[PDB]
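>> Question from a student workshop board

For tomorrow's exercise we were told to take the sequence and the ligand below, predict the bound structure, and bring the output to class. My setup keeps failing. Could a helper post the expected result so I can at least see what it should look like? The ligand is calcium ion.
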Amino acid sequence: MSPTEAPKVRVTLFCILVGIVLAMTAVVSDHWAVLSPHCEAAHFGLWRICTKRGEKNCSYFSISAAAISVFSLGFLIMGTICALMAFRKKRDYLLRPASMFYVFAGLCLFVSLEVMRQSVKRMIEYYYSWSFACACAAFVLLFLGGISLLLFSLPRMPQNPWESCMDAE
Amino acid sequence: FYWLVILIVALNTLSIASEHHNQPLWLTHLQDIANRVLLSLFTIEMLLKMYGLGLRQYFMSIFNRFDCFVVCSGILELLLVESGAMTPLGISVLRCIRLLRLFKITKYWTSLSNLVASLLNSIRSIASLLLLLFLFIIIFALLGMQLFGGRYDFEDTEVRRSNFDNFPQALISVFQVLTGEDWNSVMYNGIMAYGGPSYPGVLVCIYFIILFVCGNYILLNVFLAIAVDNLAEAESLTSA
Amino acid sequence: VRVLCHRIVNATWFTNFILLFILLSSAALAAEDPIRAESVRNQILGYFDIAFTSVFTVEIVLKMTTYGYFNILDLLVVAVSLISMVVKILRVLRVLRPLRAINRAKGLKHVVQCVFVAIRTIGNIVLVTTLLQFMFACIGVQLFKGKFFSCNDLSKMTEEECRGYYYVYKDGDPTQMELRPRQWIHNDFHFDNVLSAMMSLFTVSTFEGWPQLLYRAIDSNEEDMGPVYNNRVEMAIFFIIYIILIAFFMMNIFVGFVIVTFQEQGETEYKNCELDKNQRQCVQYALKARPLRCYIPKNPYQYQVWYVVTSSYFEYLMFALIMLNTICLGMQHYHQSEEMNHISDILNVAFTIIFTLEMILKLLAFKARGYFGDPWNVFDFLIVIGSIIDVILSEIDTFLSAFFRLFRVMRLIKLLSRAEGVRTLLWTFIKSFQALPYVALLIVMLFFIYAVIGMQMFGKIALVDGTQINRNNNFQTFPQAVLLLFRCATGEAWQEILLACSYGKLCDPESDYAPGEEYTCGTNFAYYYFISFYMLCAFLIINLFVAVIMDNFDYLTRDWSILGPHHLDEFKAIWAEYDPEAKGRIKHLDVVTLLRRIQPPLGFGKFCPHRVACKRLVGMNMPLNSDGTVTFNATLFALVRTALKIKTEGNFEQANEELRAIIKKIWKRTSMKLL
Amino acid sequence: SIEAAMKIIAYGFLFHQDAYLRSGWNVLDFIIVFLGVFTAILEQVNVVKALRAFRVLRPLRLVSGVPSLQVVLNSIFKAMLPLFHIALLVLFMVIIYAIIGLELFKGKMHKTCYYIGTDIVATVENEKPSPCARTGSGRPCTINGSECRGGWPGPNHGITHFDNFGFSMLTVYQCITMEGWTDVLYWVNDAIGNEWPWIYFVTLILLGSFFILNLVLGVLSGEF
Ligand SMILES: COC(=O)C1=C(C)NC(C)=C([N+](=O)[O-])[C@H]1c1ccccc1C(F)(F)F
Ligand SMILES: [Ca+2]
Ligand SMILES: [Ca+2]
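>> Workshop helper replied:
Here is what the output should look like for this input. Compare the format with yours to find the bug.
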């Protein structure tokens, strides 16, 4: 009850509940780039590429980011099954395997972010408004709500010779 | 009297301080007053002590050993000029000898004399660490002469002043590496003195790592076996 | 009314509400653009400087309706705030916003005072180096006055000849030359008056640029002449005596003063009681301990796999495969062959499979509840999963990221779990940084105060290349200014940054300046800024180091000859092989056979035990509960009571007399060690 | 050499010249003399210049001749037994960062700006040669009439880079000393961009320098 029902571990776990959906806001919305030739204004994403002058023509062609963000979604899936099952049956240790996947799901958007930047750099201007700063707020959420959940679930430093790490109870 | 020696102590110090380049001619001449006036007043505070309370006791004090040489070497310089023997090399050396007159405020501190009481009885322990340290520097300075002397013959035009060509200069170069200051630039010259960044000639660099690591290991056994063991006995002698 | 103004401010929702604005008020200074007062960033942050400053005005009136040294600054932070919305100095003292946090945090209230106590103590010693600095500065004025001038070409020896134009020769080539004007130049650090000489000698005491001043002094010749190469090489004696005197001995006799007089902070109280510090570090361990977990499994199929893994040959196999992965990671280099680039692709899939098989077998043998409880297996679970992903993600690259390759490097860290002496040294210092966070908080604050003031005073210098203010080293953002400051703390040509920040520098064009006012950037406040920062930082860093060395001095003088916690640490493991979980007691059929495995400082010797180990265990004080039920928090007091503290009889409750007065608080369960 | 002769035959035979051998200080005295005649003969027969540098071992015979200097080197060597767990921590830390650097910065600092058509590196008068980049995160090579091509050996005449394990470990030891570490930081920024690599560098200068010196100093305090 001490590492799983403390409030400092549930403020963090509710914070991941924000970043689990903001990284889902990014992975469906294709709004993190603006092609601006000057009409041929196109808005890039992972899955659909849509050129807007209504003449809304959304289609596909980017593959790297898409493939990389199957794993960022997937770890999110595999971390919560560890996290949803670690609040019951008095196993908070189980809570520990789950966090690692939130750092990974954090860092598998940050490849995605870097992968999407190259596409806009090789292809007329660039501007991101709606879903780069979404995912750069779900990167920084999942990457840092994962490391802090880790240190809020690893026991601590004993601070005493008698105290031992992973000390009984 | 504990407030009227500091008139000539803080006039002399001030006199020493105002020395600067391209200074006025009245300022040089005002410093011709203060050297003559205060050396006579340095006699009056000294001749009163050797006759007014005993010349046997006057030598017994440690700073009253110091008081005589201020007068005996100050008026010696005034007799050196006023004989036609201004001696152009001895005009600026002896103006650093009257710079010991601002060492007369040692009698005014009375706060860290338990350290110097302590520091003094340990100078046969001070020099045994400082000899084997200076012995260490000599062996690495001569080793750099064999490795790097005669070898910095680059057909550049840049100057590489910390080199190993003489023994005095080689010596200057080793002490520079011991402080750590720009020690990599000395190592870059020694690698290019051999072939350059290539497998035999890059092993020059282990000279510089051993001199930095083992040398500063001795520095922390020198200045910390001093300043722990000589600065805890003062703490013992103050608590007694 | 004095009762709603008294209860709102007091308890908890006023302290976590105003301080979360002080932290956000301070972040508003840092986010400011220095070059333009007209930025759309710099406009919209001023509207938070009216949003915070109306809230802190509420804090004053809600406080000054209550009552009639540290609140007169809080009135200064409000009063400057409405004014600033000389105007140039009313922006600079807007940096005092983190100082009202060191009044509200009582952990901060004390650590600022301990500095000020250590300032007044070090003052007499400080006077002695200050007078020594003056004594040496005057010797240097008599040696080097008027002698640090030179010409642009080194051919011309007096200022009268140093006129017109000379040729430089690029790349040393006498065919390739350009025309430049010659100019009589003065060295930036000189011994010309006494006050410049103290500035020169302060630089040499930091060790920064001292060979540049040394070779300038060896070449000095006469007053108003240029240098002569290797003229007076014997002036190295001046510089080397000053370094040994000031930069070594004096600095040391300043540090070792702090060390012995921070011992007194743990020594100014007096302890003439029955038990000394080594009896204190021994009794309380037996009192305050706790049994732990040895996740021994059941089910002899699982025990068949368990006897493999915890054994020595599996610990020896897996730590000799981390060594070979470390060697294979070292073997990579640039421009390598095709059969060399890919055998770091074949083996790195091979090493990933081998460590993914040891992770599986430790789930199966350790009863997977019992795997994740051990902290060095959570670290190994993250290296496994992160290096599974990089093997896939590089495979998915060529089938149709440099971060995930780092996991490969990280496996090397595992080797430090076998090293008890390095892991105990690591824990002892890491905990002491953890235990004393406010001494390091001050350093963070010092940088922060300095960086905001540096952006305000230096942030408009242009980033020209070949100077010290450039794209890599400036004051034009907060991350950059902070980085520049750190460089200075490191002392990495900090005096040359100092010269690039004084008056007369080129302003960048995106600054607001009149035509004919380009070289008006920089200020001679840089001298106070840099020297002061340099001096504040040295005090701050030695303060932190000596406070950390204090915490672990029982360990730093632990004297492994006599006795230590390590004998005790070893004991719990032995006990843990009798317990599936903690539970208190073990059987008695293990209490005879316990004493064959322990070191003779704690257990008994190497010899035949049919005299000592058979009688003294009953012969010493042991608790008498029922037959096979004797507990861990009752023997382990008495089991070290053989190793030290031998007593006579009748006074066994006179053990418990000194277990309250020389002890700390209650320790309620101590009836176990008494009888 | 007659000193090494009259100090084996004042004692006796072999097991009496072992009484000349048992103390470690006379062991140092005999390697010097043998080595001394070993180069002075091979110099005459070759009528050696690299074996000349072993004569600097002769001033260590002077610590064998002063008794109050043999009590310091023993106490100097005695302080190294506390500071070995630190020295093995420093070592593995230079190994960790060298390898990481090798992976991250391997072969990255090989483009500088040149004069167009030429093999002449372009710098400003006080600038040292630094890496360039074309159309990326690095610095863009904007001096005047220059373009950047990658045929450059590197930042200090090809010494400081991360191309192999040996040169990566030399640039990491050089940073851990705090001397020139911001040159290496600024060169990596120039090569690949300034957003990430300060994390490499500040973490090394904080763990490998400051944290290490708190423990070394602590051990010294414990010993004294
Ligand atoms: C006044 O002395 C000074 O000018 C100092 C000089 C010239 N050099 C440096 C680097 C100091 N500093 O600010 O750290 C002081 C110094 C130096 C050695 C010991 C003590 C101090 C002391 F000033 F802290 F006392
Ligand atoms: Ca230095
Ligand atoms: Ca330096």
